[model samples]
Structures are given as structure tokens and as C-alpha cells.
Target chain A: QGMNNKHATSAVHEIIREICRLVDSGHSMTRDQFHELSEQERFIAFLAEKYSSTIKLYYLADSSPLFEKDTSSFIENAFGRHANTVVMEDFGLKSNALLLAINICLAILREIN
Target chain B: QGMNNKHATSAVHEIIREICRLVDSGHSMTRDQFHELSEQERFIAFLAEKYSSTIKLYYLADSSPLFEKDTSSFIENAFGRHANTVVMEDFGLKSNALLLAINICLAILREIN
Candidate 1:
């Protein structure tokens, strides 16, 4: 069980690191181009699969106000505009993904703390 | 005048790269910490000062809907809350800054096309 936890933590951290790398590469894409990256789906699925047992355990899917909405939708709405308004939609989507990933990281950190 | 244009373009691109660097660093900050970075002020000021003569000439500030509002404020309200709501404020600010930078880059590209 302890080894499982370590693997899960490392996997999540790796996903987050990759997402941050995309943001930093200084490459901007259109909305369609961003959707093609196909990273977010895999990342979210990993969480749903690996952490299903402890997702709620980790506050990933809880009644807490923090996790109440679909993270992507919440971030999309936060921006108050469609992603296509500018070419930077790619960056915005990635940034928002990074934000959610960070939130998850911090939550996990708290659990360990 | 041609040399002046090249200098301006290079300066703006450099600023964009720096802002993108901050977004990629994976370091989150409180709103106060972000405000302290003080890069935005200099970046904006440089745009206002250097591009003033050509700002309207280059669509930095014009009657175009694209340039209608304060870029930072627009991005702030887009999130539908205060930057302090999340520790990712630094990332959000830098992302928005990058968006603006890209927009400016595209406009220049159009002119040179």
C-alpha cells in the first residue's frame, strides 16, 4: 500500500511537470491545435483510475467547495470568454490545467503533512 | 525608422519570452508576491513609451475592439474573481501577459506579411 502511494504521487507529479513544460515552451496554438495535444484526457483519466480509491480520500472528488465543478469548465468559465477569442487559448487551457494540477499537488502535500 | 522598428520588435519579443519563462517555472505565488515582481509595470511602460508613436500605427492602442480595455483588468475580470482566490495568480498574470505579447506579435507579423 505504501509503495502504491509513492507510485501514484510520482505519476501525478510527472503529469503536472509535463503540463508546465508545455506552458513554458513559448509555443502558442489555436483552440483546435490545443485540443489535439491530447494530454489532459490522459492526465484526468489517470487520476480517475489510480486514485479512485483515494480520490475522495485526497479531496479530488469531494463535497468541498474547492472540487465542486469540472476543473476545466470552472477555469473556462473563470475566463468569461470562449477559448477561441485569441490564439493564446492554447496557453490559457494549459495554464488552467497547471492550476488544477497545482491545487491537487497542494492537497496531496497537506495530506502528507 | 527601419532600424527603430527592428529594435522595437526585438524588445517586445524578449519581454514575451521572459513572461513565458515565469509561467513555466512551476512556482506559484500569492497575489502580493506577484505584484512585487514588478515586471508587468516595466513591460507595459515599455509598450506605452516605445510603441506610443506606433501604438496606434501597430494596433497596440486603437479603436479596434481588440484593444478596447485594460488588458490586465480584462484578464482579471475574465477569471470572475480576485487573483488572490488562488495561489496561481502569478501564473495567471504571466499567462495573460503572454497572451498580450502574442497578440502584439501577430499584429506585427501581419504588417510585415
Candidate 2:
């Protein structure tokens, strides 16, 4: 639906597998952990499944100082912090919470850029 | 972490509940059912949750003949059909597959329009 590429389902599966792998590998995700991981996993998986073909378009990639400025501003506004590993950890895990933290960071990058 | 609006969780729950309701209401969705419903529902719910605030920006709306032309073209290419209720039904349930059908339809609209 979102992207509908041949690899969407596989990508979604990979994302979920990664989430499970992280959790099963002895990372007590906690309420916060489950909250972030479960939802983000579901999301990226959905996107991958539906929007696989348009990965590049939907990916929200960016470049240049103007893009970086917007991204930085958006990150600060959205997350109320620097929108980096340091800020993410302050919210919950640092970079350790791979699933949610990284996803949120990406969201910041996408939205701002 | 698609949208992250305050109402994201409730919205996602509602979407899932709708799918479950359809299934319980005597709609044997089959693998196709779960395939479409689960995937689409996850997508809309994820979008609703993380990107609800910027829904319009992410929604892919369109207007006018030029826009409609592209949308129509894309739809035909994507689904290999007229991209209407009739086509949808032929693909599976007539319009009654509420949970999955409508969601997929919406996805089509988003991508094209």
C-alpha cells in the first residue's frame, strides 16, 4: 500500500526480526522499550511492505546546509532536545535502544530535512 | 514511531479493532484478509500515531485534472485495473471487505492522488 515493491514484505520481516533479535538478545526493553520498539517495528515494517518501491522517495533523505538547518530545527522542536544520541539517551536509552531511538532520530531527520 | 500524536495509540487501536470487528462479523478474510488488513491497518495506524500532526503533508493529496491524470495513471499502473470499487471487488470481496479493501483503496489514493 505504501510502497508495494517486491521486497516490501521481506523488508518488513527483516525489521521485525531485528526488533525481536534485539529484545531476545537480553535487552530488557521495559515498558518504554516495548512502547518504542513495538510501535516503530510495526511502522517501518509497514512502510517497507507497502512503500518498498518508493523507498528513496519516502525515505526523506536530504543534503546541504539548508536541509541540515531545517532538520536541526525540526529535531529540536519535535524532540525538545538536540535530536542526537545524547538527546535520545536522555529520553530513554542512548543509542542502545536501537529500534525506537534510531527510528525517532530518522523521523527527525526526515521531518526537518 | 510513525506520527506520535497524543491520540496515536487510540487511533491505532481503533484501526485494529475495526479489522477484528470485520473478521468477527462473519468475514473470513483468508490469508488475503490478514495480508491486506494487517498490513494496511498497521500502515494507517502507524501513520496516525507518528505522523498524525503532519498528516496532510504525508497524506499525498491532489487536485485538478493534471493531478488527477497522474493519479489515474499511477493507479492503473499499480493495480492493473480501473482502481475503483468494482476493480477492488474483483480483486477480492466486493466492497464488503471493509477492513482490508478500504484501507488498500486508501493506500492507492495516497500513492496516486
Candidate 3:
């Protein structure tokens, strides 16, 4: 039993270290580059499997001359959800063809720093 | 000028109709099925182009017997952002292997109902 516990602990430590590497590396990723990686859905899938959690993706849309109604309702609706709780701000650049920004947050082991 | 205005207006109307169809159809989509279509990154890309907007994606992760700190910080941080203004609640079932719930929102014409 003790051996199994130790094994699980070390295995998680390794995964967290790897996650830190992935997060830090994300700094170099351009907006276009990140969307191109959509084919590798497994990027998040792999993390979900290891962490035993659900990966929730929320797509937010904003415009240049923003609409007052859309922005207001969008804000009201977002705060309405229980799970839609973690918001990582303007997670990307604003110059792409789509002009869309995506913020990604994933499940991590509780003990991870 | 009127002719061009009318042409643009109609074209946008058509796109909104199609988006409504797509969103309604998403109701029947199984979690496994949606992720498979990731290859068509253009699914969202096309919308962003037509609308001249940026599509933002937020991935929220949570677990069973959740970690108190992760959950609290997750909620706090989500509300902390200026752009992370819209949140869709628990968007999927709990039985899947990864148990990740993904909520997707996109840009639509402000005039769209």
C-alpha cells in the first residue's frame, strides 16, 4: 500500500513538472499557431485523462466597435454560471484574421504549484 | 450605396440563420462527436471572418471531490478578467472518460436574435 502511494505521488509530480513546461512554452505561441493546433485535441485530452477532470472551453466574441447590448448581456450571462468560474483574461493577440481571442484553462492536480 | 448596404445586410441575415441552425443542431451532438470535428478549425474561423470579430475560447477544468483551493482561485480568477465576461454553465454530461465539459460561444451579428 505504501509503495503504491509513493508511486502515485511521484507520477503526479512528474506530470505537474511537464505541465509547467507546457504553460511556460505557451508564451512563444502566436494566435495563428495556436488555432492550427486544434487538430491535436489530445493536447487537452491528455491532461484531462491524467488529472481525472473535465476540460471546459468557453469561446468569447467581441467586436471592434462593440455592441452595447451584446456586451452587456454577455457579461450578465457569464457570471450566471457556476462552472464558468475561472476567467483567464485576453489570453491572446488581437490581430488575427478572425479577430477572435481564446483563453484556455485546464484541470491540474491539486497539489501542483 | 443603398444597393451595397442592402446586399451586405441580406448576406449577414443568411449567415445568422445558418448559425442558428448549427447551434440548434449542436443539441444532439455527443461529447465525443464534437471534439472529432476539431480538424475544421475553420468552423469557428469562418464565423469570425464573416462577422469581423474575435472568437475567444475559455477552457474551465474541474474534478470530483474537488480541490478547495483550485476551485476558489478558479472562480476568483475567472471573474477577475475584463474579457472573460461570458460564462456558460456545466455544458455536458458526467459519464465521459475525461469528464471534461466544454462550452462554446461565438460571434454573431449584433442584430441577430
Candidate 4:
């Protein structure tokens, strides 16, 4: 609880790796591990859902209703703090359109500040 | 079909991007477009399934029964041509452990050839 962004992101990624390992290892995870995984997913979902909350706070999930623009806007409002973090885009990973929107905001921030 | 690795990967990624865009656009795709998408995904799945075939051919899918090693091996044999492609890992993206296995094979190929 209350983990910093770096810590939280690192932890979640590591946990996902471990989960994948467990699933592939042909060994059933313990009930405790299962519970832990469920919680981890809950946290991930919480972060994703916050994108919507951010959208509510900031109307820019896309100024235009264009899919690309709207999706871009959602990302901006979601991870405004780490929008410039290019770690995800470089790898062609799925970072939710909300994250892409955050990237857009980062560009604006770059020009402004 | 039998397109160069760069072309194939680029085409697939673009098609996937278009699918995402369509879904975000709120415009229903034409039946033909939908069929094309279904075929596109079929190719993706085909590529993934080929990883298994590679394992059957080479069995590098991992030496150690350890999940990490096993998963790593699977990735090596699948994308042997593009094993050194570091685009996916840099972003914490899932390249299928089989892809990792293919990467490993590439490493071996590099030393030998």
C-alpha cells in the first residue's frame, strides 16, 4: 500500500513475471499465492480504472471525438506524472490508450514547462 | 506469406493497430474488414503456435526445468531470425516465453555461425 510509482511498477511487473513462471512451471500455486495474484490484479485494475477518474477530472481524454485523439487524451490524464517515460512505447507493448493519452500530455508539458 | 521478417512484423503490427483504432473509433467494421481481422489474428496465432513446432524441432525451449530457463528457451527457437530483436523486452512486453526461447537459439546461432 502507498507504494511509490517506481516501486509499484517494478513490483507489479515482477509479480506478473512470477505468475507467468508459476503457470508455466506445471506446479500449482498455493492458495496464498493465488490470493496474492488476485490482489495484484486488483491493484493493476485499480491503476487502469484511475484513468477514467482522471478523465473525469480533466476533460481532455481527447478534445476531438476521433478514436486516436480520444484514446490519446485518456492516457494523458491517466499517467500525467510519468507521461514522458518512454519505456512502454519503445517496446510496442499495450499501455492502454490512457497511457498514450498521458504521452500526449507529456508533449504539451514539454512545450509549456 | 513468406514475407521478410521486418515486413511481416510491421504488417502484423499495423494491422493490429488498425484493429485497435477501429474498436476505439466506435465505427463497426465491415464484414470484410472483420474477416480480414480474423485472418490477421489467425496469422498471429499461427506464428505463436510455430514456437511449439520449433521446440519440437530443437528442444531448446529450456534446459533447466526451472520456469525461467524453460520459458526462456521457448522464445529462442520461435523468432530465430529476429532473436536479437530487443524491441519487446525493453518495454516489459510479453513476447511469449517461446519467443524468448527463440532468442536463446539466436544467441547460439551467433556463436556457431
Listed models, DockQ each: 0.03, 0.04, 0.02, 0.02
Error in Å for residue B104 of model 3: 30
Q: Estimate how well candidate 1 is docked, as a DockQ score.
A: 0.03
Residue-wise lDDT of candidate 3 within A1-113, one digit each (tens)? 12232233233323222332233222223444434433332332333343344322221112223223333232223222311333222323233211111122212111111
Q: What are the lDDT scores of the predictions, listed in order?
A: 0.35, 0.33, 0.27, 0.31
Each model's backbone clash number? 0, 13, 14, 23
TM-score-wise, the better of 2 and 4 is: 4
Ten residues in sequence with the least summed lDDT for candidate 4 chain A: A53-62
**Worst 10-residue stretch by lDDT in candidate 4 chain B?**
B55-64
Assign candidate 1 its CAPRI class. Answer: incorrect
Best-matching candidate per DockQ? 2
Candidate 4 structure quality by residue, lDDT tens digits, A8-109 = 322322323332222222323233332332334332233334434322212222332322433233233333334334433332334234223222322332
C-alpha displacement of A16 in model 3, angstroms? 5.2
**Candidate 3: misplaced stretches above 4 Å?**
A1-16, A22-27, A42-113, B1-113
TM-scores of all predicted structures: 0.25, 0.22, 0.18, 0.23
Residue B111 of model 1 has an lDDT of: 36
Better of 1 and 2 by TM-score: 1
- Those runs of model 2 whose alpha carbons end farther than 4 Å from true positions after fitting are A1-60, A64-68, A76-98, A102-113, B1-9, B13-33, B36-113
Model 3, range B5-103, lDDT digits (tens) per residue? 223323332322233223222222333433433222223233334433433222111221322333323222322231133222232332221111112
